[PDB]
């Protein structure tokens, strides 16, 4: 696991719902045990999501953004 920035799968940012209510939950279905809302000056707006596995993935950039 690792502690960062959720975006979507793969090289996106989320957008959050400031509260973290929303993006929280999203964060728990994937698979992190909490989940926060965070802003990552690049992209934008994004989630944060603790103890979600590597095989669920998060801010790059190289491509774009995908799904």
């Given amino acids: 696991v690792?502690?960062?920035y959720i975006a979507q799968p793969?090289?996106?940012?989320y957008h959050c719902?400031?509260?973290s209510s929303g993006c929280?939950?999203?964060?728990?279905?994937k698979?992190?045990?909490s989940g926060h809302c965070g802003f990552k000056?690049?992209?934008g707006l994004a989630c944060?999501?603790?103890?979600?596995p590597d095989n669920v993935g998060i801010i790059?950039?190289?491509?774009?953004c995908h799904s």
């Fill in 17 to 19: 719902f400031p509260g």
């Fill in 48 to 52: 944060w999501c603790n103890a979600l």
């Fill in 24 to 29: 929280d939950t999203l964060c728990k279905e």
């Fill in 2 to 4: 690792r502690d960062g």
């Fill in 41 to 43: 000056v690049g992209h």
């Fill in 60 to 64: 790059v950039e190289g491509e774009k």
């Fill in 10 to 13: 793969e090289n996106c940012v």
């Fill in 31 to 33: 698979g992190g045990t």
